[PDB]
Antibody, heavy 220, light 218 residues
Framework: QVQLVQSGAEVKKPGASVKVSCKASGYTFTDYYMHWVRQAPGQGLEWMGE????????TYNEKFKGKATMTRDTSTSTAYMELSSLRSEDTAVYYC????????????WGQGTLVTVSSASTKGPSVFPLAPSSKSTSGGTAALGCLVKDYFPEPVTVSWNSGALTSGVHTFPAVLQSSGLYSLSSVVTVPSSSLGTQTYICNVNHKPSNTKVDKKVEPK | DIVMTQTPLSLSVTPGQPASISCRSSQSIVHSDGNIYLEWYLQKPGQSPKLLIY???YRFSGVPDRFSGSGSGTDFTLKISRVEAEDVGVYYCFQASHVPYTFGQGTKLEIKRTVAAPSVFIFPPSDEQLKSGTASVVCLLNNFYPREAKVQWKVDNALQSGNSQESVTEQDSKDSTYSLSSTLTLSKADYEKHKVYACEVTHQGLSSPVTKSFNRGE
């Protein structure tokens, strides 16, 4: 199984540098070129350049020369993308991608790394339960969730029961409060009959603040 | 550079009906080997793009027979014979014939479905949050269609303004619905001054507004 596993979300002040990693597995790392793609608001998807994993040879999109530096470490099957002299415009999701055919039609992609460039203060969220009650029932079903309040920058990820619970989950887009802090909610609809036997835990991650919370949501 | 222009910018389709997306290149995209490395990707919110079509017409492994590609010179077309709920998202064309490789701006595909009224739920502030001096009340509108929905917060029947935020999900890949979460945030002191907290919902699937409420303490 071909896998491209990227490093977590980062937040940097203007003028700083960041080095995003892409760990490859399930194929011979030196067989295929590693490509980097940017997804920035307004600018859309853009191909940044490619790295030959054998010699570390690189071809850049001219728009990214002097901004991006691509490297590789064959001993760990890891490709790297370093962004220098960070500015607000560098806030984007960065993807590593390969074309296993040996041609540049990309078939496998990393999960992406969100890099945010800001002078605003980083803040970890508070995680509060949205307990199932008679006010959150609908014809034998109960809704429950987690409120992920006051964080900066994006992203917050939420899973339920370590990824074993996905059906009926809605993880809402974050809202931006006047304070400049984000908030989001994640909910799930479950059988009301089994509230006493099943355990519901929301796993909340906010990498920029090293927040990693597993909140058990208790019925009311 | 080679500019890839997609038409239309968005489309709304009933399942079973055909869809067609065009991708125009500013210059020809024939590679030195004689092939046209024109690809079509589908991307869903918060996910990486997924390859559908490569080299103009080749269907990538696992992609449904419903998807097909054609084209020559500067005009390329992605066709969905019969659209399905799972097709929802943004479609991008991509050329890898000449460096630098370039993408189209994307075409958003929306799915039409029948009217579905939301299931409305309300959540009082948690005891944990109340201890921190703040009170957030959450109103959840689950699995409705169309996306247009109106939430109004009422505290002891008085209409609230300026103390709430809401967001809507992307369209569901399985049932083509939307969900909405609205949060009313007050200070704990302001929360303790009132009894009735209500969420009033207006939607096309409802003949009169639906009020979901609770009494603070109960």
């Amino acid at each position: 199984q071909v896998q491209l596993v990227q490093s977590g979300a980062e937040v940097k002040k203007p003028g700083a540098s960041v080095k995003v990693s892409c760990k490859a597995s399930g194929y011979t790392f030196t067989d295929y070129y590693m490509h980097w793609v940017r997804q920035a608001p307004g600018q859309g998807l853009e191909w940044m350049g490619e790295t030959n994993p054998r010699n570390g040879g690189t071809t850049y999109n001219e728009k990214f020369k002097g901004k991006a530096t691509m490297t590789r470490d064959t001993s760990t099957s890891t490709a790297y993308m370093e962004l220098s002299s960070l500015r607000s415009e560098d806030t984007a999701v960065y993807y590593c991608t390969i074309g296993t055919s040996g041609y540049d039609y990309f078939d496998y992609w990393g999960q992406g790394t969100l890099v945010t460039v800001s002078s605003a203060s980083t803040k970890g969220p508070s995680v509060f339960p949205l307990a199932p009650s008679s006010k959150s029932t609908s014809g034998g079903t109960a809704a429950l969730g987690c409120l992920v309040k006051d964080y900066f920058p994006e992203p917050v990820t939420v899973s339920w029961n370590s990824g074993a619970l996905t059906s009926g989950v809605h993880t809402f887009p974050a809202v931006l409060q006047s304070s400049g802090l984000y908030s989001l909610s994640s909910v799930v609809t479950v059988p009301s009959s089994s509230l006493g036997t099943q355990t519901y835990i929301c796993n909340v991650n906010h990498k920029p603040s090293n927040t990693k919370v597993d909140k058990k949501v208790e019925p009311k | 550079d080679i500019v890839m222009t997609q038409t239309p910018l968005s489309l709304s389709v009933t399942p079973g009906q055909p869809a067609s997306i065009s991708c125009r290149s500013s210059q020809s995209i024939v590679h030195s080997d004689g092939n046209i490395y024109l690809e079509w990707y589908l991307q869903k919110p918060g996910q990486s793009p997924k390859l559908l079509i490569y080299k103009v017409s080749y269907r990538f492994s696992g992609v449904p027979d419903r998807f097909s590609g054609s084209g020559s010179g500067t005009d390329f077309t992605l066709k969905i014979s019969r659209v399905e709920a799972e097709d929802v998202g943004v479609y991008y064309c991509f050329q890898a014939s000449h460096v630098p490789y370039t993408f189209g701006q994307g075409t958003k595909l929306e799915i039409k479905r029948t009217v579905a009224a939301p299931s409305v739920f309300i959540f009082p502030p948690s005891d944990e949050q109340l201890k921190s001096g703040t009170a957030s009340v959450v109103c959840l509108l689950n699995n409705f269609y169309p996306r247009e929905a109106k939430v109004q917060w009422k505290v002891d029947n008085a209409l609230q303004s300026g103390n709430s935020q809401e967001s809507v999900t992307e369209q569901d890949s399985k049932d083509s619905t939307y969900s909405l979460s609205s949060t009313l945030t007050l200070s704990k002191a302001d929360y303790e001054k009132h009894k009735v907290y209500a969420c009033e919902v207006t939607h096309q699937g409802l003949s009169s507004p639906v009020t979901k409420s609770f009494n603070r303490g109960e």
